[PDB]
Amino acid sequence: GSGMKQIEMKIEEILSKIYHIENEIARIKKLIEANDREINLVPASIKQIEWKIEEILSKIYHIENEIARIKKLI
Amino acid sequence: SGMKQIEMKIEEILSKIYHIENEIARIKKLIEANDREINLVPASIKQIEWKIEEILSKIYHIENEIARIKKLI
Amino acid sequence: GMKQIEMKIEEILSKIYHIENEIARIKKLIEANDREINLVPASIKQIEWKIEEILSKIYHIENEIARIKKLI
Ligand SMILES: [Br-]
């Protein structure tokens, strides 16, 4: 029966390797989700810097107009 | 009978493998999707770094007009 | 019978070996996405320092201007 035994052995080994593959996959999916979550945080930070910049540019616009006033008076 | 049961097991294994192969195919797509989103970011940063350059130069010039005014009054 | 079974087993083993290699690649691709993602909070922090510097420069400029207007 050693031919059949060898077969049943190889089968067990295959089932065992599958189990481990299914588990590596479940990990991989969480890693991807971990990377997905970080990626999503970025835009809000960029957006916030962008509002800050617009507000600086506004304040500089006004400053330039105050200076223009002062020049014309002196 | 011993053989029949080996044959069913082989059938199930091939089936589990078929599913695995579809899950991997899907995982790749999602890793390529994350490369796509990650990759927009650098250009965004550069656009900001350019506005900051503009701004630092406006300020320098402002500081210099102010210095000239202070000498005139 | 046995010869068919043996041949299918060999196919399955080489399918599994291929899957294990694809998994190994995928893990490297994920780790490299990770790295790129982690370089971002640094870039954002440096910008934020520049912005702080600029807002402090503006505050001071507004002060200079307010004092000029008092004199004239
Ligand atoms: Br990823």
Side-chain angles (χ1 to χ4, degrees), chain A residues 1-36 38-46 48-53 56-68 70-71 73-74, chain B residues 1-25 27-31 33-35 38-45 47-50 52-53 55-67 69-73, chain C residues 1-3 5-7 9-24 26-27 29-30 32-49 51-72:
Chain A
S2 71
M4 284 285 277
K5 273 156 158 195
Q6 183 84 73
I7 295 167
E8 280 159 11
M9 202 172 58
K10 284 220 176 52
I11 286 168
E12 294 182 17
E13 135 197 42
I14 288 156
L15 284 174
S16 168
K17 297 180 150 87
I18 287 152
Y19 176 87
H20 173 260
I21 287 163
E22 295 178 334
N23 292 297
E24 288 266 52
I25 284 152
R27 268 178 216 94
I28 271 153
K29 281 147 67 161
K30 296 207 297 160
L31 293 179
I32 294 159
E33 291 173 30
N35 275 348
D36 201 354
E38 290 228 50
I39 286 182
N40 297 343
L41 301 183
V42 172
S45 301
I46 289 301
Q48 284 155 216
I49 282 143
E50 288 171 359
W51 324 333
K52 216 62 221 254
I53 289 194
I56 280 162
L57 280 166
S58 184
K59 293 186 185 85
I60 284 172
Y61 174 88
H62 193 92
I63 280 153
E64 290 167 341
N65 292 315
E66 291 302 313
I67 287 152
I70 292 161
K71 285 167 68 166
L73 300 157
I74 68 178
Chain B
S1 206
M3 303 250 289
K4 278 208 62 166
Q5 71 204 2
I6 285 159
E7 272 170 46
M8 313 192 289
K9 282 182 186 157
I10 285 177
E11 298 190 56
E12 181 56 15
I13 287 159
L14 283 169
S15 193
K16 290 164 153 144
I17 286 158
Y18 177 74
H19 177 240
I20 289 154
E21 285 166 335
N22 300 313
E23 289 273 17
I24 285 157
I27 271 140
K28 283 188 181 151
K29 288 208 294 259
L30 300 169
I31 289 166
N34 286 349
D35 192 326
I38 284 151
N39 279 309
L40 291 154
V41 184
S44 270
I45 291 305
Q47 281 158 212
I48 283 152
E49 290 165 346
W50 304 331
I52 290 178
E53 274 179 313
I55 293 151
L56 295 168
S57 306
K58 264 100 115 193
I59 291 169
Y60 177 75
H61 185 255
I62 286 170
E63 285 168 341
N64 291 305
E65 300 251 59
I66 286 168
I69 291 168
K70 279 154 95 168
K71 294 198 270 209
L72 294 162
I73 78 191
Chain C
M2 297 299 172
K3 299 203 296 309
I5 282 164
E6 281 154 29
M7 191 183 64
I9 283 174
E10 295 309 298
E11 297 168 44
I12 279 160
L13 291 171
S14 75
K15 305 221 243 303
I16 288 162
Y17 166 73
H18 179 241
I19 295 177
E20 286 161 337
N21 299 331
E22 284 268 12
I23 287 178
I26 273 150
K27 280 165 166 165
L29 311 167
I30 287 163
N33 278 355
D34 167 330
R35 290 196 201 85
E36 298 296 337
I37 284 155
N38 284 0
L39 292 170
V40 183
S43 315
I44 282 181
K45 259 152 155 203
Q46 305 175 138
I47 291 168
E48 284 174 332
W49 298 331
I51 289 167
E52 286 165 36
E53 191 214 294
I54 288 162
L55 290 165
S56 306
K57 283 170 143 76
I58 290 176
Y59 178 90
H60 183 268
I61 282 165
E62 294 175 333
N63 271 348
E64 295 294 317
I65 286 163
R67 285 201 322 280
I68 285 152
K69 287 157 72 150
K70 263 155 50 55
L71 293 161
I72 69 189

